[PDB]
Amino acid sequence: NQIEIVFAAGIALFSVAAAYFFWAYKKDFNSAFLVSFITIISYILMLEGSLVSAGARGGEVYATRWLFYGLSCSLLMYEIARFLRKSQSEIVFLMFLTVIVMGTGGAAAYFEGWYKIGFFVLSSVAYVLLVYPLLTSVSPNRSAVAKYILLGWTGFPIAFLLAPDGFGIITTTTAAILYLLLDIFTKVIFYFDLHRKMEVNAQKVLAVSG
Amino acid sequence: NQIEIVFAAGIALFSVAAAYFFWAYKKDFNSAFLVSFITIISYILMLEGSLVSAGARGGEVYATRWLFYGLSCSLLMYEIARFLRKSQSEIVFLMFLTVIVMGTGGAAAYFEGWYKIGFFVLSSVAYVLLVYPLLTSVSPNRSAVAKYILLGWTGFPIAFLLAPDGFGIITTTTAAILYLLLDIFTKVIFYFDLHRKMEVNAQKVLAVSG
Amino acid sequence: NQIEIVFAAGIALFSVAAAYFFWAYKKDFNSAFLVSFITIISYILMLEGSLVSAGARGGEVYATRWLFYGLSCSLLMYEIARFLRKSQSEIVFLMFLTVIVMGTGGAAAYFEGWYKIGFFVLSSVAYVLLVYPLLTSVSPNRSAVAKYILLGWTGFPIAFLLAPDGFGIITTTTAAILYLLLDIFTKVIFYFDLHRKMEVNAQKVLAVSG
Ligand SMILES: *C\C=C(C)/C=C/C=C(C)/C=C/C1=C(C)CCCC1(C)C
Numbered sequence: 001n002q003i004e005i006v007f008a009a010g011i012a013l014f015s016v017a018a019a020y021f022f023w024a025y026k027k028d029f030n031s032a033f034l035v036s037f038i039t040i041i042s043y044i045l046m047l048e049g050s051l052v053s054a055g056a057r058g059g060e061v062y063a064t065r066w067l068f069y070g071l072s073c074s075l076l077m078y079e080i081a082r083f084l085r086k087s088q089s090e091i092v093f094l095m096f097l098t099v100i101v102m103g104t105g106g107a108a109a110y111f112e113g114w115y116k117i118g119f120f121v122l123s124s125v126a127y128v129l130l131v132y133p134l135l136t137s138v139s140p141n142r143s144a145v146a147k148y149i150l151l152g153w154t155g156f157p158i159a160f161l162l163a164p165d166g167f168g169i170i171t172t173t174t175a176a177i178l179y180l181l182l183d184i185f186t187k188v189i190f191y192f193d194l195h196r197k198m199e200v201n202a203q204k205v206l207a208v209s210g
Numbered sequence: 211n212q213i214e215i216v217f218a219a220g221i222a223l224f225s226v227a228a229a230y231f232f233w234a235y236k237k238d239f240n241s242a243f244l245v246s247f248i249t250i251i252s253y254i255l256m257l258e259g260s261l262v263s264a265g266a267r268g269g270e271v272y273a274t275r276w277l278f279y280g281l282s283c284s285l286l287m288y289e290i291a292r293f294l295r296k297s298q299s300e301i302v303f304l305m306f307l308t309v310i311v312m313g314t315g316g317a318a319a320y321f322e323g324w325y326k327i328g329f330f331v332l333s334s335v336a337y338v339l340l341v342y343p344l345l346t347s348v349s350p351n352r353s354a355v356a357k358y359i360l361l362g363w364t365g366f367p368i369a370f371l372l373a374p375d376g377f378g379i380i381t382t383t384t385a386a387i388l389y390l391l392l393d394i395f396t397k398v399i400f401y402f403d404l405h406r407k408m409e410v411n412a413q414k415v416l417a418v419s420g
Numbered sequence: 421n422q423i424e425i426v427f428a429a430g431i432a433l434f435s436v437a438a439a440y441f442f443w444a445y446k447k448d449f450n451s452a453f454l455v456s457f458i459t460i461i462s463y464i465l466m467l468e469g470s471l472v473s474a475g476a477r478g479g480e481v482y483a484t485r486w487l488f489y490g491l492s493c494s495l496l497m498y499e500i501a502r503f504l505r506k507s508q509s510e511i512v513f514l515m516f517l518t519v520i521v522m523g524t525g526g527a528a529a530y531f532e533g534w535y536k537i538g539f540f541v542l543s544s545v546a547y548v549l550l551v552y553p554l555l556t557s558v559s560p561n562r563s564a565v566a567k568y569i570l571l572g573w574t575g576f577p578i579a580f581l582l583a584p585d586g587f588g589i590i591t592t593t594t595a596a597i598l599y600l601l602l603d604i605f606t607k608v609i610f611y612f613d614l615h616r617k618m619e620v621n622a623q624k625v626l627a628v629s630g
């Protein structure tokens with residue numbers, strides 16, 4: 001009952017964000033639009049109940065959340081890594097790491113016992129490899145970005161461990177509200193905050209070889 | 211009984227098209243070959259009955275059709291967008307839209323009630339965003355292409371609404387014949403018609419910077 | 421019992437290989453690391469028993485093995501094709517073929533009767549198209565590479581036909597040991613053997629236009 005309302009709020013908010021982002025930005029590759037549109041699909045699937053499995057302490061796990069993050073967060077990571085002027089091959093690497101983090105997180109959420117532990121460890125290893133080059137970047141853009149990695153991206157494995165995906169210390173519904181707050185921060189606030197600086201950065205890189 | 215014959219015809223025709231396209235074209239990236247080869251796989255899976263679900267008015271839905279279109283139609287969209295000399299980042303955007311249209315169409319086909327409606331709406335929104343830059347292109351190549359978008363690509367959501375995927379006004383078998391006709395048009399006739407002009411266009415773009 | 425030990429050995433070995441490859445190579449796009457990390461995930465899923473189906477002569481089939489090869493072997497194929505200085509569009513083509521080979525091989529393994537035969541034929545056709553430009557390459561690098569294609573990549577369809585995936589002449593456990601030997605050869609020995617020559621090749625291509 002309660003969790004349907006959370007998922008409905010997610011559908012509504014990301015529909016508004018997608019419509020806004022498409023209208024506000026240039027009518028070309030709009031990662032902000034795609035990230036939100038994909039998240040709409042993900043929230044509808046969770047509302048539908050398409051793959052709900054038993055979590056810890058009697059909660060539920062919605063492992064398609066994590067699988068769709070493999071797509072939307074790769075777009076986010078493209079923006080972040082470009083913003084920090086990583087090389088093209090490091091951008092691709094970081095995007096691969098991102099997909100791996102999300103895919104193994106979905107496995108860790110769904111599976112049990114030692115499989116959950118094993119997949120959570122692999123996800124965490126790839127995640128350390130993902131954020132270390134972001135957090136240690138010498139780019140002047142590192143601090144604008146660090147707050148998304150530290151409070152947003154890193155909030156997810158913390159929420160995961162508390163949630164039925166992990167130990168089940170908090171309920172399914174409270175976990176879902178937490179994931180929705182983190183989604184708004186990493187997928188919507190991120191662009192309101194950084195869209196213009198990222199576009200200006202993209203123009204400077206285009207104009208200046210090297 | 212009848213629908214097995216339709217799917218068998220699809221297997222046979224796309225096997226011949228793939229063999230022809232591989233032989234006829236250069237032994238390099240051959241999108242025509244890949245589009246047909248992928249469609250072969252899709253028809254075998256539908257003949258096998260791998261994920262058949264109940265549609266409207268007592269028909270059947272073969273939602274893997276739509277999922278495989280996310281792969282083969284991205285290759286088609288690459289050809290179309292390149293043909294109209296869209297920028298590299300607009301090509302990628304249009305390819306993303308294409309995958310979204312097909313993925314949400316497969317969800318709309320499979321799911322029911324308000325979920326079918328919701329996913330059909332999201333698919334239609336992405337589809338309007340996909341074809342608007344194609345149909346309004348100033349490229350001299352726009353008219354050669356418009357007939358595929360207007361009669362072929364747009365025939366699919368019309369067939370979908372009539373089919374058990376949508377309202378079920380026509381039977382599963384009649385829908386499948388219609389989808390096969392649309393497949394031959396958008397995946398085979400398309401290349402017989404446009405292959406040479408697309409290759410010439412690709413050569414001119416390679417030779418002339420700007 | 422016995423096969424759990426094989427899968428555990430795979431988990432252990434690829435974890436060591438991934439850790440070694442990440443440490444040994446440059447902290448940038450590391451295909452050797454990703455190939456091994458992905459294979460870890462695949463072995464954990466097979467140990468878990470996530471999609472086990474009945475094979476021939478009373479064996480078992482682990483069709484997720486083949487599906488994950490579509491990802492790890494595309495990275496390998498990127499390295500191989502680059503090593504032979506194939507053009508960018510031929511590299512993409514070969515990578516598409518690779519995904520098709522693995523995807524249809526997973527279908528052939530899982531399905532039965534004429535579907536197994538049909539999908540094995542399609543996989544074999546794409547595989548001939550994949551290796552013919554590798555085996556006939558005029559690159560001086562062709563011979564270093566030919567032993568991986570001839571003994572490793574081609575060992576898989578042979579093992580497949582013997583295994584419960586195919587005729588079931590050998591048991592599930594013996595097939596799994598054979599696949600693990602082939603994995604170590606094509607994914608680990610490959611890099612110990614060829615890593616330096618591939619990096620030197622990549623530097624020469626970067627430095628010399630044409
Ligand atoms: C929705 C938007 C974003 C940026 C989501 C990010 C998610 C993560 C960083 C999740 C990480 C995980 C870790 C590191 C390990 C356990 C499994 C998780 C997938 C929750």
Ligand SMILES: *C\C=C(C)/C=C/C=C(C)/C=C/C1=C(C)CCCC1(C)C
Pocket residue numbers: 276279283286311312314315316318330333334337362363364366367370392393396397
């Ligand atoms: C097989 C070849 C092609 C070009 C297929 C194209 C399919 C579509 C354009 C389908 C579109 C859909 C729409 C717009 C909305 C409902 C769901 C559909 C997937 C049928």
Ligand SMILES: *C\C=C(C)/C=C/C=C(C)/C=C/C1=C(C)CCCC1(C)C
Pocket residue numbers: 486489493496521522524525526528540543544547572573574576577580602603606607
């Ligand atoms: C794990 C690493 C590698 C390089 C795996 C390669 C696998 C193949 C070349 C498999 C080929 C198949 C063929 C050609 C036809 C039957 C199905 C297979 C997938 C086994």
Ligand SMILES: CCCCCCCCCCCC
Pocket residue numbers: 029070071074075078099299302
């Ligand atoms: C303009 C360039 C955007 C690049 C988008 C890359 C596509 C990411 C797909 C990841 C699939 C899991």
Ligand SMILES: CCCCCCCCCCCC
Pocket residue numbers: 088091092095096099
């Ligand atoms: C500049 C565009 C880079 C696109 C990066 C692609 C990442 C692909 C990851 C695929 C993993 C499934």
Ligand SMILES: CCCCCCCCCCCC
Pocket residue numbers: 177
């Ligand atoms: C059922 C008792 C009412 C629950 C009130 C808590 C809901 C507020 C959640 C808001 C999260 C932003």
Ligand SMILES: CCCCCCCCCCCC
Pocket residue numbers: 239280281284285288309509512
């Ligand atoms: C020669 C360039 C061809 C580009 C092919 C792009 C690959 C599309 C994959 C889409 C996956 C759903």
Ligand SMILES: CCCCCCCCCCCC
Pocket residue numbers: 298301302305306309
């Ligand atoms: C010039 C090659 C452009 C390739 C476009 C890639 C599209 C990736 C879409 C991935 C969505 C799942």
Ligand SMILES: CCCCCCCCCCCC
Pocket residue numbers: 387
């Ligand atoms: C069962 C009665 C015969 C059905 C004849 C209609 C089949 C012709 C379909 C051709 C579609 C191109």
Ligand SMILES: CCCCCCCCCCCC
Pocket residue numbers: 089092449490491494495498519
């Ligand atoms: C440095 C360039 C590496 C290119 C990696 C391509 C991504 C392959 C994804 C294939 C998905 C099945």
Ligand SMILES: CCCCCCCCCCCC
Pocket residue numbers: 508511512515516519
């Ligand atoms: C130089 C990087 C080339 C990357 C090749 C992408 C191959 C995409 C195959 C997608 C099939 C699902």
Ligand SMILES: CCCCCCCCCCCC
Pocket residue numbers: 597
């Ligand atoms: C159960 C009888 C012992 C089986 C011994 C064979 C195991 C050796 C396999 C090693 C493969 C490299």
